[PDB]
Amino acid sequence: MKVRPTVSSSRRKARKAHFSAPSSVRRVIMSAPLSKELREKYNVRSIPIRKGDEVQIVRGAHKDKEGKVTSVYRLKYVIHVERVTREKATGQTVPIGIHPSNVVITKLHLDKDRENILARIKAGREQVAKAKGK
Amino acid sequence: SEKAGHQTSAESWGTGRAVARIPRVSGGGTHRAGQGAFGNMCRSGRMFAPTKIWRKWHVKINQGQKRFATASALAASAVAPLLMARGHQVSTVPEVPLVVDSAAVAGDAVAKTAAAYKLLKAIGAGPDVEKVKKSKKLRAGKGKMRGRRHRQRRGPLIVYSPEHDGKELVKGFRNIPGVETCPVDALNLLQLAPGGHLGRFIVWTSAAIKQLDAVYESKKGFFLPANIVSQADLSRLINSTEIQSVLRAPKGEARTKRAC
RNA sequence: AAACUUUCAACAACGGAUCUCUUGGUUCUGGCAUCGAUGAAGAACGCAGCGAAAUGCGAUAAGUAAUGUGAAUUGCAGAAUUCCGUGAAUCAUCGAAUCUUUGAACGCACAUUGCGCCCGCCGGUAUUCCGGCGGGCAUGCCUGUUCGAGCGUCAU
RNA sequence: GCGUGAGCCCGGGUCGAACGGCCUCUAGUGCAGAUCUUGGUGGUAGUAGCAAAUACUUCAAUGAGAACUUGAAGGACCGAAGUGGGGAAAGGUUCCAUGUGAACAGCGGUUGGACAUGGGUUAGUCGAUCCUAAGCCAUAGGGAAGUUCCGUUUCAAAGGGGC
RNA sequence: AGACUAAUCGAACCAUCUAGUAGCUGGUUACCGCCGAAGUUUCCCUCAGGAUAGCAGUGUCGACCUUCAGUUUUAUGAGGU
RNA sequence: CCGGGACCGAGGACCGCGCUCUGCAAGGAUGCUGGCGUAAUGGUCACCAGCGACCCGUCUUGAAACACGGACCAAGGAGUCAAGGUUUUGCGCGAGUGUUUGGGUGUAAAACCCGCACGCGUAAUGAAAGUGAACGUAGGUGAGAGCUUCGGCGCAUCAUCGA
RNA sequence: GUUGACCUCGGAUCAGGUAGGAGGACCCGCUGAACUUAAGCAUAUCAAUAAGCGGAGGAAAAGAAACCAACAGGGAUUGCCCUAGUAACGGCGAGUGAAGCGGCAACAGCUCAAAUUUGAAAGCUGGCUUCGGCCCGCGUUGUAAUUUGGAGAGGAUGCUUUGGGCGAGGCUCCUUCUGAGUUCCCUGGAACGGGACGCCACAGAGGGUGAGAGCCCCGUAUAGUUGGAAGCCAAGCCUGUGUAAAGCUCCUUCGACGAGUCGAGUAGUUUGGGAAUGCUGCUCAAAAUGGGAGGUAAAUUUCUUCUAAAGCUAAAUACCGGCCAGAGACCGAUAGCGCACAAGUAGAGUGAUCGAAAGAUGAAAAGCACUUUGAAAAGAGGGUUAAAUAGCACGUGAAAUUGUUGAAAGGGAAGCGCUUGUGACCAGACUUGCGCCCGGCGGAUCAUCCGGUGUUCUCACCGGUGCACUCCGCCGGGCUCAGGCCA
Ligand SMILES: [K+]
Ligand SMILES: [K+]
Ligand SMILES: [K+]
Ligand SMILES: [K+]
Ligand SMILES: [K+]
Ligand SMILES: [K+]
Ligand SMILES: [K+]
Ligand SMILES: [K+]
Ligand SMILES: [K+]
Ligand SMILES: [K+]
Ligand SMILES: [K+]
Ligand SMILES: [K+]
Ligand SMILES: [K+]
Ligand SMILES: [K+]
Ligand SMILES: [K+]
Ligand SMILES: [K+]
Ligand SMILES: [K+]
Ligand SMILES: [K+]
Ligand SMILES: [K+]
Ligand SMILES: [K+]
Ligand SMILES: [K+]
Ligand SMILES: [K+]
Ligand SMILES: [K+]
Ligand SMILES: [K+]
Ligand SMILES: [K+]
Ligand SMILES: [K+]
Ligand SMILES: [K+]
Ligand SMILES: [K+]
Ligand SMILES: [K+]
Ligand SMILES: [K+]
Ligand SMILES: [K+]
Ligand SMILES: [K+]
Ligand SMILES: [K+]
Ligand SMILES: [K+]
Ligand SMILES: [K+]
Ligand SMILES: [K+]
Ligand SMILES: [K+]
Ligand SMILES: [K+]
Ligand SMILES: [K+]
Ligand SMILES: [K+]
Ligand SMILES: [K+]
Ligand SMILES: [K+]
Ligand SMILES: [K+]
Ligand SMILES: [Mg+2]
Ligand SMILES: [Mg+2]
Ligand SMILES: [Mg+2]
Ligand SMILES: [Mg+2]
Ligand SMILES: [Mg+2]
Ligand SMILES: [Mg+2]
Ligand SMILES: [Mg+2]
Ligand SMILES: [Mg+2]
Ligand SMILES: [Mg+2]
Ligand SMILES: [Mg+2]
Ligand SMILES: [Mg+2]
Ligand SMILES: [Mg+2]
Ligand SMILES: [Mg+2]
Ligand SMILES: [Mg+2]
Ligand SMILES: [Mg+2]
Ligand SMILES: [Mg+2]
Ligand SMILES: [Mg+2]
Ligand SMILES: [Mg+2]
Ligand SMILES: [Mg+2]
Ligand SMILES: [Mg+2]
Ligand SMILES: [Mg+2]
Ligand SMILES: [Mg+2]
Ligand SMILES: [Mg+2]
Ligand SMILES: [Mg+2]
Ligand SMILES: [Mg+2]
Ligand SMILES: [Mg+2]
Ligand SMILES: [Mg+2]
Ligand SMILES: [Mg+2]
Ligand SMILES: [Mg+2]
Ligand SMILES: [Mg+2]
Ligand SMILES: [Mg+2]
Ligand SMILES: [Mg+2]
Ligand SMILES: [Mg+2]
Ligand SMILES: [Mg+2]
Ligand SMILES: [Mg+2]
Ligand SMILES: [Mg+2]
Ligand SMILES: [Mg+2]
Ligand SMILES: [Mg+2]
Ligand SMILES: [Mg+2]
Ligand SMILES: [Mg+2]
Ligand SMILES: [Mg+2]
Ligand SMILES: [Mg+2]
Ligand SMILES: [Mg+2]
Ligand SMILES: [Mg+2]
Ligand SMILES: [Mg+2]
Ligand SMILES: [Mg+2]
Ligand SMILES: [Mg+2]
Ligand SMILES: [Mg+2]
Ligand SMILES: [Mg+2]
Ligand SMILES: [Mg+2]
Ligand SMILES: [Mg+2]
Ligand SMILES: [Mg+2]
Ligand SMILES: [Mg+2]
Ligand SMILES: [Mg+2]
Ligand SMILES: [Mg+2]
Ligand SMILES: [Mg+2]
Ligand SMILES: [Mg+2]
Ligand SMILES: [Mg+2]
Ligand SMILES: [Mg+2]
Ligand SMILES: [Mg+2]
Ligand SMILES: [Mg+2]
Ligand SMILES: [Mg+2]
Ligand SMILES: [Mg+2]
Ligand SMILES: [Mg+2]
Ligand SMILES: [Mg+2]
Ligand SMILES: [Mg+2]
Ligand SMILES: [Mg+2]
Ligand SMILES: [Mg+2]
Ligand SMILES: [Mg+2]
Ligand SMILES: [Mg+2]
Ligand SMILES: [Mg+2]
Ligand SMILES: [Mg+2]
Ligand SMILES: [Mg+2]
Ligand SMILES: [Mg+2]
Ligand SMILES: [Mg+2]
Ligand SMILES: [Mg+2]
Ligand SMILES: [Mg+2]
Ligand SMILES: [Mg+2]
Ligand SMILES: [Mg+2]
Ligand SMILES: [Mg+2]
């Protein structure tokens, strides 16, 4: 149960905030879990998904398929992964939208800022446990 | 709202125009022109006797009658047949009233939810806790839109002494569904007879049971009531020698034979 | 006997009731005190790669600077960054700026994109005329400065 | 199938996300009428009618389709106080060219003041701008609790010309 | 001409007081069970309206109070049709 | 004292009143036999036949009325809420009763706790100054449920004479 | 005569400033109705209200007694409870109506005029300025210090009081970080459903994800933790010093105190205010132990209590108009605001103003490629989808009213009640059950006794014994009894 007076538990207000969120908030809403190997390597459990990293599908009809993230369509709350597609009546190929909460990241795109994210969350995630241990 | 249905300037057309007498909107060029207004029978009108905020929402109860009812509920909580008739599962509890030693008092004695859950199982309260977990449904109407989505059953109530036990056990029992806590000196009739039905299942602590008599001694203007009868067992009275020896002989049987 | 009229069922029509849904209302409770001559509230006209409205903005015009975040926007297209460092975005924040014509509205007017005056710079032979550009000129009242009026009135 | 009754329960079809029994609590709680309110739909009925302003006919072309589209040839009307040629008030693109399924032109339509896409208004001499009329409003002053009323030369120290 | 003052004139049009008042006309929503009327008295600027008594229902309490009666009989009064 | 027909069979161990007394017609139907075991009995609907049957709501002494409203269908549509009185039902305490204007406290608009004043009641009567409820086992007489040592004691309430 | 002042009144696009408009829910004033009730109506009521006008703030206003009282006396203002539907007003009709005392919320006090600094205008706006001051001006028709009735001034008397600077530490705001299954089987287009096995919990609030998810994602609990800014409070330390200024105790004597104001008459309005409660107009118009009040007009004599005609000031109280936030036994698209949508919009009126209708394909557009008939709109095939009985005239799809197919009736209405008939369609009920005897088949262990354990203390259960005329089950044959409908 919630305690603090600044927190609201209202169905009407919660749906409004979700479906009208700006772009920098939609980034955090679209997160995915890491795989067991990466989770052990980095001591991180989840991260916002980015274009240019590998993924495996674990729910829905397109299960056990893999590929790279080709686009993050924040206005639709879906992602596109290469080679998971469909054909129109004319025979043209069109991608299928997958919600990022039923994939697992098996390899992540890395740069200077991405490394800062992973280091920052890890340091806090272990400081909490160290203080909790007393 | 105070002004709903009265934000127009309608006036009756009077008799002679072959229409019913009722205020009608004035103007032209819209659908709204010429339509009825101000009535409780009219679309977009005003309702009959609009509701006000100065109706009585609260009720005053004599404090003596409050104290009578809470004492009557405590007595009913020590009758095992009444516990079963209110839906509680108590087939494996050793005694009623159920009292546990002060092993729930120390710093972090049951301050973890895992520890508190483990203690309820050993004592014999486990089946009543699992009854709540398995009962959970979606509410069956428009209450879902208004913040009340689910319904479930009630479990045991835990009574403790905040002065001796330490009040840290509230954290441990809070997250388990169905379990409530209350101090011994602030007992609540809403929890002791939920829904107006008697026989709540209660788990006491040793320190709390010792304090219960001192609590009732210090209530100015209240004393425990006297009953209107003295022996509640009706069969002992009727079938005693004092009464059966002075009766007249029976005039008939439970079934009368038909004559003519 | 058909056709016609009437009653019931199945399928097909007309119409939008019923059931379920809700980024909207309504009522209560708690916190805070901040418009304008340094030009407000309101009105008009414009601004996008492809827009009529709605939303945003003002010739720096679907926005500029600055700070944070860290890879998009998306109906189409192109292009940019692609996180090296020089940094996507109708993102968040917001302390520096721009801010057309009006409006208490202020050179005089206005049913007119009407008619004047003062100071300076630049051109045309020019202190005086014509054109371009910049800065100015409302009313009531207060304190001070300076120039005055009156046998109101003092001394010489 | 049950119930004197208001009603309750089951079978068959359609459909797609929530719902009921029992004891208490609570109310914006039960419709045929009010020339009742809002919305939808009949008979009448393929009915009343589509008759002022004299009037149309032949050939060819276009087109799926021609009485009311275009060419030529006949027959007619308005008869200079015109059914002609230009303006003021008012409207605001109705003007021109190309093209077009539906809707509109109370019959039709290949035509249109309709629908879509583009184009079109050039002044020192014609107007406005300048002057005053009937009138309206500032300034000096006087009323009115006040929004404001009167007052237009007055019981005012009210200007402009040169070097 | 009681004529005209935007299809409005024996006192225009618009918003508000305003859900103005009506002893007067119209309407007023499921079922079964038991009981069951009045249009008469007195007063009122009272006569299409009220108060007041009567007629009706519901809740009870006192005893299950030799208790009563829209009737006959016997004795005994009053009356001017 | 003998015949002939029609309709009906409630009840469910024994018990009673009786008689013509191995038993019976006496406090309510049994015995024997045939056909058929399914649409045969039974039920729903449609239609013909015999008898019966004026349009509802409303005002009115009187409505089927030549008295008014009503073409049809769906959804909406009218004795409520507050303060102040009163009688009656249920509940707590009882010569008293009432926490909640406020304070304490809290798992925080809930629940729990506190007590100084105050309201109603405990005494009336006069315009007012004012005064202010026992002769008696809290009286006598007639009724009176219940109890009773059978002599009486006598609730509630009614009528009556007194303080 | 010249020149130089002062007083009053003016000019300037002189130097520097300031007001108007919006908003108006709540606040401070002015002005001012009628509908209605009185069963008619004029005083009355509605109401010291609606409409109209002026002026402010986060609150405004009020406020430190010319008060209440009649006591053994209280002691600035405001608000709640009570006083109290009371005293009183009123065609004494309908109706109206306060205050003192008492308990609580919140608490806080002050400064001018009237005196000679007179051994020294000791005071202030503006300009320029090394920053230290200088210069003009205001002002003696009065700018500072001193005094405000609680006092005070003027004298005695001898004790006491004060100025600067650091400052640990804490509080408020922003920001970084936070536990646990996508384990196995079934249905399904898709598990977020059912079954099995686990884990977290100071976190089982809420929302999303292809259907009801504590452990898939955002968040939710707890004290902490990385970084940044500005304020406030504050334990305790380091320093001067009496030129000056301040408090207390006593006293002969002094002791200034607001004028067309108070008060009186009269007129109007208002109040519960009654020979007149407040306000305003006109006429008259004061005083020094004087003046006001002391709820019945007047004269005489006492008593009580304050100190008018000048001024400032936080809190408890009102309000959802403005900017934010949290909620509910409220409404669910003819409801709820007029507006869930490009709504104060489209549209009407010369104008002031009036003012609607209108939400829902599917998880995903995968929004129908190709062939064929047609001038075209479209149709027929063929595709997508879990579904086109979801095709943008899109969830579900009722009634009035209409088309086709099928059944039936009809000599100037139809519909309805009771009761047979015919045709069509249909729910039940019945199918066997218990018992006895004979035979076959299989399994035990039936009665009794010993040990243990319960329990209603005499009744049972478990282990051992039993071992074929006992006990249990099945099958085959015969017999009695009971069983459905109409007679
Ligand atoms: K209105
Ligand atoms: K008519
Ligand atoms: K709990
Ligand atoms: K609905
Ligand atoms: K715009
Ligand atoms: K002009
Ligand atoms: K079905
Ligand atoms: K036709
Ligand atoms: K003609
Ligand atoms: K002609
Ligand atoms: K010109
Ligand atoms: K020229
Ligand atoms: K012009
Ligand atoms: K000109
Ligand atoms: K003139
Ligand atoms: K004026
Ligand atoms: K008009
Ligand atoms: K009448
Ligand atoms: K006679
Ligand atoms: K009977
Ligand atoms: K009637
Ligand atoms: K009729
Ligand atoms: K009562
Ligand atoms: K009392
Ligand atoms: K007796
Ligand atoms: K001057
Ligand atoms: K309001
Ligand atoms: K006003
Ligand atoms: K009193
Ligand atoms: K000086
Ligand atoms: K002074
Ligand atoms: K510090
Ligand atoms: K599957
Ligand atoms: K699966
Ligand atoms: K499951
Ligand atoms: K006076
Ligand atoms: K005096
Ligand atoms: K007096
Ligand atoms: K509406
Ligand atoms: K218009
Ligand atoms: K399915
Ligand atoms: K299909
Ligand atoms: K569908
Ligand atoms: Mg998923
Ligand atoms: Mg009107
Ligand atoms: Mg409404
Ligand atoms: Mg429902
Ligand atoms: Mg501006
Ligand atoms: Mg410009
Ligand atoms: Mg200029
Ligand atoms: Mg000025
Ligand atoms: Mg759905
Ligand atoms: Mg209703
Ligand atoms: Mg109806
Ligand atoms: Mg009716
Ligand atoms: Mg015809
Ligand atoms: Mg014609
Ligand atoms: Mg004609
Ligand atoms: Mg023609
Ligand atoms: Mg002619
Ligand atoms: Mg001619
Ligand atoms: Mg043309
Ligand atoms: Mg054309
Ligand atoms: Mg036509
Ligand atoms: Mg046509
Ligand atoms: Mg055409
Ligand atoms: Mg056009
Ligand atoms: Mg000219
Ligand atoms: Mg004027
Ligand atoms: Mg003037
Ligand atoms: Mg006219
Ligand atoms: Mg009404
Ligand atoms: Mg009316
Ligand atoms: Mg009867
Ligand atoms: Mg009279
Ligand atoms: Mg009548
Ligand atoms: Mg009696
Ligand atoms: Mg009786
Ligand atoms: Mg006579
Ligand atoms: Mg029988
Ligand atoms: Mg037979
Ligand atoms: Mg039959
Ligand atoms: Mg008949
Ligand atoms: Mg007749
Ligand atoms: Mg009538
Ligand atoms: Mg009619
Ligand atoms: Mg509805
Ligand atoms: Mg100047
Ligand atoms: Mg203003
Ligand atoms: Mg009224
Ligand atoms: Mg009246
Ligand atoms: Mg009347
Ligand atoms: Mg009248
Ligand atoms: Mg007003
Ligand atoms: Mg302000
Ligand atoms: Mg305040
Ligand atoms: Mg103030
Ligand atoms: Mg004073
Ligand atoms: Mg005193
Ligand atoms: Mg006081
Ligand atoms: Mg009282
Ligand atoms: Mg009162
Ligand atoms: Mg009054
Ligand atoms: Mg002093
Ligand atoms: Mg002194
Ligand atoms: Mg987390
Ligand atoms: Mg869901
Ligand atoms: Mg969830
Ligand atoms: Mg699961
Ligand atoms: Mg004074
Ligand atoms: Mg007045
Ligand atoms: Mg007066
Ligand atoms: Mg809300
Ligand atoms: Mg609708
Ligand atoms: Mg609506
Ligand atoms: Mg729909
Ligand atoms: Mg097709
Ligand atoms: Mg379906
Ligand atoms: Mg349709
Ligand atoms: Mg549909
Ligand atoms: Mg139909
Ligand atoms: Mg028939
Ligand atoms: Mg054995």
Q: Name the helix (H) or strand (E) containing A130.
A: helix A112-132
Question: Residues at the strand E interface (CB under 7 A)?
Answer: B 6, 8-9, 26, 38, 46, 49-50
Contacts of A1 in chain B (CB under 8 A): 174
CA–centroid distance, residue A89 to ligand 61 (Å): 73
HSE, side-chain direction, 13 A CA sphere, residue B59 = 3
Q: Is B229 exposed, middle or buried (0-12, 13-18, 19+ CB in 10 A)?
A: exposed
Q: What is the DSSP letter of B224?
A: P
Residue A110's Cα: distance from chain center in Å? 15
**Residue A23, CB half-sphere, CA atoms under 13 Å: how many?**
4
CB-CB under 8 Å, B145 with A11: yes
- C-beta atoms surrounding B178 within 10 Å: 17
d(CA B5, CA B50): 11
CB A122 within 8 A of CB A43: yes
Helix (H, G, I), strand (E, B) or coil at A102: helix
Report the nucleotide nearest the CA of residue B59, measured to C1'.
F100
Number of H-type helices and E-type strands within chain B:
9, 6
Question: Which amino acid belongs to residue A114?
Answer: R
- Resolved by: cryo-EM
CA distance A34 to B100: 47
Asked if B198 and B86 count as a contact pair (C-beta separation under 8 A), the reply is: yes
